[PDB]
Amino acid sequence: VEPVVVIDGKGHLVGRLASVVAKQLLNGQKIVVVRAEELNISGEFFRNKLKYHDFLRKATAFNKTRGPFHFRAPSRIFYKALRGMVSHKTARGKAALERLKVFEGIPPPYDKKKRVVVPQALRVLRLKPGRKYTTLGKLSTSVGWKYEDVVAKLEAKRKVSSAEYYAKKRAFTKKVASANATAAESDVAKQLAALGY
Amino acid sequence: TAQQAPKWYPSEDVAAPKKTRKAVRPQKLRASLVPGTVLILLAGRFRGKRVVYLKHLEDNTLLVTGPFKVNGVPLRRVNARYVIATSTKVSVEGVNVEKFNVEYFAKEKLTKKEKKEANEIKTERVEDQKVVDKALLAEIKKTPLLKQYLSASFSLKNGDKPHLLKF
Amino acid sequence: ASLPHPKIVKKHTKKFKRHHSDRYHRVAENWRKQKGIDSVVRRRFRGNISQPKIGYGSNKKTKFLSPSGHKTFLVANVKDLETLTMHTKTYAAEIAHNISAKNRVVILARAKALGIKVTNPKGRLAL
Amino acid sequence: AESHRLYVKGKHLSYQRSKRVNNPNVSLIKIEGVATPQDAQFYLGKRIAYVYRASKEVRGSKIRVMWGKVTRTHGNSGVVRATFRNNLPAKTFGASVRIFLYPSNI
Amino acid sequence: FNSSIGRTAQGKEFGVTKARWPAKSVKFVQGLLQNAAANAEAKGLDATKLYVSHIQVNQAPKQRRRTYRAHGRINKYESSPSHIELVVTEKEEAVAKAAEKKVVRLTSRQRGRIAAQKRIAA
RNA sequence: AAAUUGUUGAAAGGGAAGGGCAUUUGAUCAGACAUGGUGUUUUGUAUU
RNA sequence: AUACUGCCAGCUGGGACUGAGGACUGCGACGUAAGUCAAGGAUGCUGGCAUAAUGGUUAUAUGCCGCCCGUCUUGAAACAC
RNA sequence: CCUGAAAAUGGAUGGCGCUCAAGCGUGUUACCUAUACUCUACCGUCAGGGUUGAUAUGAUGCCCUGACGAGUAGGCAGGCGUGGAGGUCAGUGACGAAGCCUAGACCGUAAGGUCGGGUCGAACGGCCUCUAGUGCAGAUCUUGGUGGUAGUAGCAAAUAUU
RNA sequence: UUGGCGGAAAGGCCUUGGGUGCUUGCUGGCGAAUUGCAAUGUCAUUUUGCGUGGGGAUAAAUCAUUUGUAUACGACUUAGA
């Protein structure tokens, strides 16, 4: 439907989001996933750390450089889950994985564009209240990701600029409303209301 | 030789068809297709344009006009499957339409040799189009914004789902 | 101007090639049925070459017909055209590869006189 | 004005298939905006075009078209089955097709 | 024919790492080059535009000899002679041009569209 | 003649290659339009 | 009254695939009359092209499949020959 | 559900992943798709039948049919090719036979047959029959020829040459 | 033309002003056929060229020689108008 769909990864369960995004990419939709460090996984943090250590234990014995490459960044973890959900060894799977892009935080191309959510992947809607969960950034830094703090700093700066922009947009909308309330309740507005608009 | 002659031989006559039992019956149109109604032409040179449905021709075709003065669609016929019927209807009373038919839309197809490798309108056609269009305009102007609606060309917008849309 | 006949349908327009004729040069493309005990082709495993079967047989009303609907008829001379002289609509002549140039032009002229269609009226002459 | 689209957008998802065998004679089409078989029943019988472009001119155009038709619905989620005069080239899994509004019945 | 030959610094001119200096083959090739230059001069060619337009070496009948191996065995010791042929041609520019017409075929709707565009534009 | 080579040309090539179904793309190619029927403003004038 | 079951030789639509056969023959239906018909298998109308456009072959790409044949063997892709 | 619950390359509810599940027990329903079932076209097999007509048909000729179709070892039947032989085509051919090459064409389910284009140089084929030293992918098959390995192992004992 | 702001992959956002074109905000005048009853009916993109013009400066690598802080060979530290 859209050229690119940009997904706020915050609050999203990694598996549900990966399944949704893999289906979309195979269906032909370009997807950019931001805030990967704020993705959620159900279950306790210690549990998912044990799961990642089980993943880490697997490596090609005679040469560890041929073995599974245990990527540590939250974006790379999400990408690994999605590549597992895509038939990545065929040209169609490669095309879908090319359609996908995933980042930590929100880079400059996408901090100025709209970001959406997938309610069938959101933890607040899916997980039962009182269930423990972990954050991909916390797990990643526990297992060797080196940029929790750089991303947090850039995120604070970006959120500051975006909050200033939102304050300006609110002011403009409120002033538009104040100025055009005089032109409101007019005959044209009444006809539109009768028509349903 | 290789094949002198086959002793059994085929027959020379060409077979005649069996007496088929398929009688042609008049077409039944949908209840939304009544003369004087506004149709959106879905295909052709004038695709998406709003025209006025005038008469059901004998060869299952619908006689329509723009009116030409309003949107440039002339007195043509269109396939009833390639239009969308709209609830908007002009009073087709006041315009005689009995003249036009299949023989009226006679073309004298070009010959095979006459090939336009690189590279007009009949006067009776243009005058009767003027008459039909003047009657249609006198009717149309009684309803506000209808002439401009017919001048506008229908298009699908982002979020326009025709399976829920009402025409 | 031609006999209304059923549209000529070919069930299998592909050539039934012998198994491993692509693998080895000693194995020709001429079809041979695999008689091996473990043969995947003989056992009709999925993803393997199809084998010729009588279910592929052509409709008897259209069998042996050319694309034009004629049945091709190898001719060597005018006496060989004489059999077709009355069946212009169902038989087409094919001049034998062995016919010399002058005899070939004689056959072509006689077939043009009798309206017989020739399936190779361009051999042994330049374009 | 700027919109001339007279068709609905769709995606060619895949061929009709089981887990391990596909059928190129039937294509699965998702119609954008449609998410139920009840809503997809509108598009039954509607014509579909896969429009693509080649680098070589054929008959005065560099654009080629493969026509087809929505035959039935597929599943519970608004996907439909479509049949094309030539099977879709299988590189178009996820490519855009145009579901026209004719033959119209409204 | 380079497998398990040594590397050299003089292959960088050609992008490879394995290059060699076949003195005997080079001598044969340049002798045939001299012969071809003589033939072209006799034919009256340019001798400065001349370039090796064709060169082709293929295998010749082998010359057989014997080598002797442990435990009283005899193996072959073959020469691998070559037929070398070459043709020198005077250089020239891209003379060819004016490709095929590819006459067009339009339908009635295409012809009408072209006519309408020609009318609308000025 | 084949195996096996050289050159040219055309193609693919992310740890084989080859194959089946289906399409697409590029090449290449066969199938009524002289005719058992009507008829004509003469292509170069037993009729064209 | 509605459910819910069952029946209708009840009505109204929207789609798809197929069109075998080819010189009268049959069984029926239509105010019980010459005729007609949806009754022992598709006809009617219309358009574009008349060409590599359809199609064939061929090479490649893509989707899904596809283990190396022969043999002995209960069992072979076999780290069996 | 947890404890009980320890094995060696790294590792498998098939994988990813899943926690009011995408887990477990249960209950409506919708949907997906086998070479199965229903209905059509066509192929073949089997069978039960029709058919004596003044020419234009060698009567399992033409036709109505209904059912059916897996297959090793094995049986049987219809055919396709090869070398010779008897008849015939008063068959093809130095104006080009036979051979050979050709991601050219047609026919046949196939065995294969026919043709277009190159090469060439003296014989060859269709049909009805007869005959057999009659069809190859293998047998560590035979005899010739040829590969990759591979411009590789190597050409280093006996003092040594300039 | 005037302020900037934006470094996470900034390559995007207004404005300061002068010029020009449309304005469906409300009312008129002319044109559209014939593409014939549909045929996507053709409208957006990592490159270049005997070519045209708003402008710009005339570099290195490699082989050969040398080196020994290197070295099986390639490579590698070096030097040489």
XYZ file of N, CA, C and O in Angstrom, chain A residues 93-152:
240
model
N 13.836 -14.790 -1.182
C 14.179 -14.448 0.189
C 15.235 -13.363 0.274
O 15.177 -12.496 1.150
N 16.215 -13.395 -0.633
C 17.212 -12.331 -0.677
C 16.577 -10.997 -1.042
O 16.950 -9.959 -0.489
N 15.615 -11.003 -1.967
C 14.919 -9.770 -2.319
C 14.136 -9.220 -1.133
O 14.132 -8.007 -0.891
N 13.473 -10.094 -0.373
C 12.751 -9.634 0.813
C 13.703 -9.065 1.866
O 13.451 -7.993 2.442
N 14.808 -9.764 2.130
C 15.770 -9.266 3.103
C 16.450 -7.989 2.629
O 16.913 -7.201 3.461
N 16.528 -7.774 1.314
C 16.955 -6.484 0.789
C 15.896 -5.416 1.013
O 16.230 -4.248 1.243
N 14.618 -5.792 0.933
C 13.549 -4.841 1.224
C 13.564 -4.407 2.682
O 13.067 -3.324 3.010
N 14.103 -5.239 3.568
C 14.127 -4.891 4.988
C 15.338 -4.033 5.355
O 16.449 -4.252 4.865
N 15.108 -3.046 6.228
C 16.158 -2.278 6.886
C 15.793 -2.103 8.354
O 14.638 -1.822 8.679
N 16.773 -2.260 9.242
C 16.528 -2.177 10.679
C 17.673 -1.417 11.340
O 18.842 -1.600 10.984
N 17.332 -0.555 12.300
C 18.288 0.344 12.931
C 18.070 0.381 14.436
O 16.994 0.051 14.940
N 19.113 0.800 15.151
C 18.992 1.204 16.546
C 18.721 2.701 16.602
O 19.391 3.483 15.921
N 17.748 3.095 17.415
C 17.370 4.489 17.388
C 16.681 4.819 16.074
O 16.175 3.946 15.364
N 16.659 6.109 15.753
C 16.009 6.548 14.521
C 16.974 7.441 13.747
O 17.138 8.624 14.083
N 17.627 6.915 12.716
C 18.585 7.709 11.932
C 17.934 8.917 11.275
O 16.697 9.039 11.242
N 18.748 9.828 10.737
C 18.239 11.100 10.179
C 17.210 10.941 9.069
O 16.320 11.796 8.953
N 17.306 9.943 8.177
C 16.244 9.830 7.160
C 14.870 9.589 7.755
O 13.877 10.061 7.186
N 14.783 8.905 8.893
C 13.514 8.425 9.415
C 13.047 9.130 10.677
O 11.905 8.906 11.095
N 13.878 9.964 11.311
C 13.353 10.706 12.456
C 12.409 11.816 12.020
O 11.675 12.350 12.857
N 12.404 12.164 10.734
C 11.525 13.193 10.196
C 10.302 12.622 9.488
O 9.561 13.383 8.860
N 10.078 11.315 9.559
C 8.944 10.678 8.905
C 8.074 9.963 9.931
O 8.464 9.753 11.082
N 6.877 9.591 9.488
C 5.904 8.954 10.363
C 6.324 7.526 10.696
O 6.815 6.789 9.837
N 6.125 7.136 11.954
C 6.411 5.787 12.419
C 5.135 5.148 12.948
O 4.364 5.782 13.675
N 4.925 3.887 12.587
C 3.698 3.175 12.904
C 4.012 2.039 13.873
O 5.162 1.789 14.230
N 2.957 1.346 14.304
C 3.074 0.201 15.194
C 2.262 -0.953 14.623
O 1.403 -0.774 13.757
N 2.552 -2.148 15.123
C 1.838 -3.364 14.744
C 1.132 -3.889 15.989
O 1.744 -4.612 16.788
N -0.146 -3.553 16.191
C -0.808 -3.900 17.461
C -0.846 -5.390 17.757
O -0.947 -5.771 18.930
N -0.777 -6.250 16.739
C -0.690 -7.680 17.007
C 0.717 -8.114 17.388
O 0.950 -9.313 17.571
N 1.658 -7.177 17.490
C 2.994 -7.454 17.990
C 3.333 -6.666 19.244
O 4.351 -6.956 19.881
N 2.510 -5.690 19.620
C 2.826 -4.826 20.747
C 2.686 -5.585 22.058
O 1.689 -6.275 22.287
N 3.696 -5.450 22.919
C 3.719 -6.192 24.175
C 2.573 -5.783 25.093
O 1.950 -6.639 25.728
N 2.274 -4.484 25.163
C 1.218 -3.997 26.049
C -0.127 -4.616 25.688
O -0.973 -4.837 26.563
N -0.342 -4.923 24.410
C -1.584 -5.552 23.981
C -1.533 -7.073 24.023
O -2.561 -7.709 24.278
N -0.369 -7.672 23.782
C -0.258 -9.118 23.633
C 0.047 -9.833 24.944
O -0.644 -10.793 25.296
N 1.069 -9.392 25.670
C 1.465 -10.078 26.893
C 0.451 -9.844 28.004
O -0.124 -8.760 28.133
N 0.236 -10.879 28.807
C -0.662 -10.776 29.945
C -0.034 -9.904 31.030
O 1.169 -10.006 31.286
N -0.811 -9.026 31.667
C -0.248 -8.179 32.726
C 0.361 -9.017 33.840
O -0.218 -10.009 34.286
N 1.537 -8.596 34.299
C 2.287 -9.348 35.281
C 3.291 -10.325 34.713
O 4.019 -10.958 35.488
N 3.352 -10.477 33.393
C 4.369 -11.309 32.769
C 5.670 -10.530 32.634
O 5.672 -9.366 32.225
N 6.777 -11.179 32.978
C 8.076 -10.540 32.849
C 8.478 -10.441 31.383
O 8.022 -11.209 30.533
N 9.337 -9.470 31.092
C 9.850 -9.280 29.747
C 11.220 -8.634 29.842
O 11.609 -8.097 30.882
N 11.949 -8.704 28.741
C 13.238 -8.050 28.611
C 13.228 -7.071 27.459
O 12.356 -7.083 26.587
N 14.235 -6.218 27.476
C 14.447 -5.234 26.439
C 15.671 -5.639 25.633
O 16.683 -6.086 26.192
N 15.552 -5.509 24.312
C 16.608 -5.975 23.426
C 17.913 -5.239 23.685
O 18.988 -5.836 23.610
N 17.842 -3.943 23.994
C 19.058 -3.205 24.300
C 19.762 -3.727 25.538
O 20.988 -3.883 25.549
N 18.999 -4.002 26.597
C 19.585 -4.544 27.820
C 20.203 -5.917 27.576
O 21.325 -6.193 28.023
N 19.500 -6.786 26.848
C 20.073 -8.093 26.539
C 21.332 -7.958 25.688
O 22.336 -8.645 25.927
N 21.297 -7.066 24.699
C 22.424 -6.892 23.792
C 23.657 -6.395 24.527
O 24.766 -6.887 24.297
N 23.490 -5.412 25.410
C 24.640 -4.938 26.165
C 25.119 -5.992 27.152
O 26.309 -6.029 27.484
N 24.212 -6.842 27.646
C 24.644 -7.930 28.511
C 25.479 -8.949 27.748
O 26.349 -9.597 28.337
N 25.229 -9.108 26.445
C 25.941 -10.120 25.668
C 27.045 -9.543 24.785
O 27.703 -10.306 24.067
N 27.269 -8.231 24.806
C 28.437 -7.697 24.127
C 28.227 -6.547 23.161
O 29.153 -6.173 22.436
N 27.025 -5.980 23.130
C 26.765 -4.810 22.304
C 27.348 -3.570 22.974
O 27.140 -3.345 24.171
N 28.070 -2.763 22.201
C 28.946 -1.739 22.755
C 28.372 -0.328 22.711
O 29.062 0.609 23.124
N 27.142 -0.139 22.242
C 26.651 1.209 21.969
C 25.305 1.468 22.624
O 24.447 2.150 22.057
N 25.096 0.950 23.836
C 23.873 1.305 24.548
C 23.842 2.794 24.862
O 22.778 3.420 24.821
N 24.999 3.374 25.195
C 25.030 4.745 25.693
C 25.074 5.765 24.562
O 24.459 6.832 24.664
N 25.798 5.464 23.482
C 25.793 6.347 22.319
C 24.385 6.459 21.752
O 23.902 7.559 21.441
N 23.697 5.322 21.630
C 22.330 5.316 21.124
C 21.407 6.070 22.072
O 20.535 6.824 21.632
N 21.586 5.889 23.383
C 20.741 6.591 24.346
C 20.944 8.101 24.270
O 19.979 8.870 24.351
